[PDB]
Amino acid sequence: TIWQVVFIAFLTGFLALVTIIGNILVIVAFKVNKQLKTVNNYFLLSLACADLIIGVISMNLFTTYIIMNRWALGNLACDLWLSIDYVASNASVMNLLVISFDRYFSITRPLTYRAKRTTKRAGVMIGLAWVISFVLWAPAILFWQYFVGKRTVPPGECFIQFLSEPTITFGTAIAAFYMPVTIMTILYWRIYKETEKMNIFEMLRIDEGGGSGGDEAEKLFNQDVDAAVRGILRNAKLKPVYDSLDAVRRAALINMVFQMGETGVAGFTNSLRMLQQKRWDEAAVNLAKSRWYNQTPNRAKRVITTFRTGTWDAYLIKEKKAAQTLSAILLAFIITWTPYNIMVLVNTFCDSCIPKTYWNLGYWLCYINSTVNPVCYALCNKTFRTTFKTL
Numbered sequence: 262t263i264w265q266v267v268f269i270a271f272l273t274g275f276l277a278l279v280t281i282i283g284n285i286l287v288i289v290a291f292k293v294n295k296q297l298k299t300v301n302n303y304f305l306l307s308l309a310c311a312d313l314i315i316g317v318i319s320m321n322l323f324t325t326y327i328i329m330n331r332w333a334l335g336n337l338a339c340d341l342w343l344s345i346d347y348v349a350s351n352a353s354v355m356n357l358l359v360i361s362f363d364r365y366f367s368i369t370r371p372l373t374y375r376a377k378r379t380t381k382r383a384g385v386m387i388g389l390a391w392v393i394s395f396v397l398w399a400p401a402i403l404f405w406q407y408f409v410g411k412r413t414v415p416p417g418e419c420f421i422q423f424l425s426e427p428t429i430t431f432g433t434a435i436a437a438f439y440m441p442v443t444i445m446t447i448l449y450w451r452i453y454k455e456t457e458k459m460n461i462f463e464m465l466r467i468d469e470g471g472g473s474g475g476d477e478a479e480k481l482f483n484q485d486v487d488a489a490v491r492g493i494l495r496n497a498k499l500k501p502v503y504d505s506l507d508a509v510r511r512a513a514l515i516n517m518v519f520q521m522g523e524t525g526v527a528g529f530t531n532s533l534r535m536l537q538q539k540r541w542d543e544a545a546v547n548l549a550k551s552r553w554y555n556q557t558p559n560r561a562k563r564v565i566t567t568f569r570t571g572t573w574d575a576y577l578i579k580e581k582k583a584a585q586t587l588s589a590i591l592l593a594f595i596i597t598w599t600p601y602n603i604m605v606l607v608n609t610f611c612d613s614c615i616p617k618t619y620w621n622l623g624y625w626l627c628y629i630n631s632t633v634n635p636v637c638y639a640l641c642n643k644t645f646r647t648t649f650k651t652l
C-alpha cells in the first residue's frame with residue numbers, strides 16, 4: 262500500500278539529513294579549528310565533501326525513484342545524477358586507498374616517507390582522485406548514448422547505459438571495488454601487525470621529537486647506540502642493572518644514558534637498585550621525584566612508564582589510534598558496499614535471480630556509508646569530539 266511508502270519516505274529523509282549535518286559539521290570543524298588541518302585529516306575532508314554531495318543529492322533523488330517508482334526528472338537530470346553519484350563515490354574509494362597508502366608507508370618505510378608528508382602532496386592526491394573519477398565515469402555516463410546512436414535507457418527509468426551488460430558491470434566492480442578492498446585489506450593487516458614493531462632507535466626518535474635522518478645518519482645513530490651499550494657494560498654500577506633488565510626496559514635505560522650519560526644515570530642508586538630487584542612501582546615513584554623528571558617531564562614520563570609496565574605502551578599511543586580509526590573506516594566501507602558488489606557478482610552468472618527490491622536495498626546500503634564515516638571521526642579521534650562541541 263501507501264502506508265509503507267510514507268514510512269519509507271520518512272526513514273530515507275532521516276538518514277539523508279543526518280548525512281548532511283554530519284558532514285557539514287566536519288567541514289565547519291575543519292574550517293574553524295586550524296589544528297585539525299593535518300595530512301591525514303585533510304584526506305578525511307575529501308570524504309566529507311563527497312559524502313555531502315551524496316547526502317544532499319544522491320540520497321534524495323534515489324528516494325524519489327523508489328516512491329514514484331519512476332524517474333520524473335528528465336534525461337539530462339538522470340545522466341547528471343548518475344555522474345554525480347558515481348564520480349563522487351568513486352573518489353570516495355580512491356581516498357580510502359590514499360589513506361591506506363598514507364599509513365602503510367609510515368609503518369613500512371619510516372625513514373624516507375614520514376618526513377615527506379606535506380600539505381602540498383596531500384592536496385595534489387585529492388585533486389587527482391576527483392579528476393580521474395570524473396574522466397573514468399562522466400564521459401561514459403553522459404556521452405555513451407551519442408556514441409551508440411540511441412538511448413537504451415527507457416523513459417521512466419534511470420541507469421547507466423554502458424553498464425547495461427552484467428559482464429561489463431562485473432569487470433567494473435572488480436577494478437573499482439574488489440581490487441581496492443583487497444589492497445586495503447592487505448595493508449590493514451600489515452599496519453595492525455606492525456604496530457609493535459618498536460625498537461630503541463625509534464624510541465629515542467619520539468623522545469627527542471626527532472626526525473628521520475639520512476642513510477648516513479642511521480649508521481651514525483647505530484654507532485652511538487652500540488657505544489652507549491658498551492659504556493653501560495663497562496660501568497660497574499650500571500652493568501648489574503642492565504643485565505637484570507629485559508629488552509624493553511634495557512632500551513629505557515639506554516634512553517637515560519643517551520640523555521644524561523653513563524655517569525649521570527649511575528647516580529640513581531636507589532632507583533637502579535629497585536630496577537634490579539624488579540620493584541617497578543617503587544622505582545617509578547622514585548624516578549618521578551628527581552631533577553630528571555622536572556628538566557624533561559615528557560621524555561621522563563615515557564621512560565618511567567616503560568619501566569613500570571615493561572612494554573612499549575607509552576610509545577604506541579598515537580599509532581594505535583591511527584589504526585583504530587582506519588579500522589572503523591574500512592569496516593564501515595567493506596560492510597555497506599559488499600552486498601551490492603556481491604549482487605553484481607551473482608547477476609553476472611544468471612538472468613532473473615536478483616529482485617529489484619534487493620537492488621534498491623543494496624544501493625541504499627552504500628549510502629549509509631556517508632553517514633557512518635562522520636561518526637567514525639568522533640568515535641575514535643578525541644580531537645574531532647571537542648571540535649563538534651564548539652560547533
Ligand SMILES: C[N+]1(C)[C@@H]2C[C@@H](OC(=O)C(O)(c3cccs3)c3cccs3)C[C@H]1[C@@H]1O[C@@H]12
Pocket residue numbers: 346347350351354424430431433434435437438439598601602605623624625627628
Ligand atoms: C550505490 N552507489 C551509488 C553505486 C554502487 C556502489 O558502487 C560499487 O559497487 C561499484 O563497485 C560498482 C557498481 C556498479 C558497477 S561497479 C563502484 C562504482 C563506482 C565507483 S565503485 C556504491 C555507490 C557508487 O556509485 C555507485
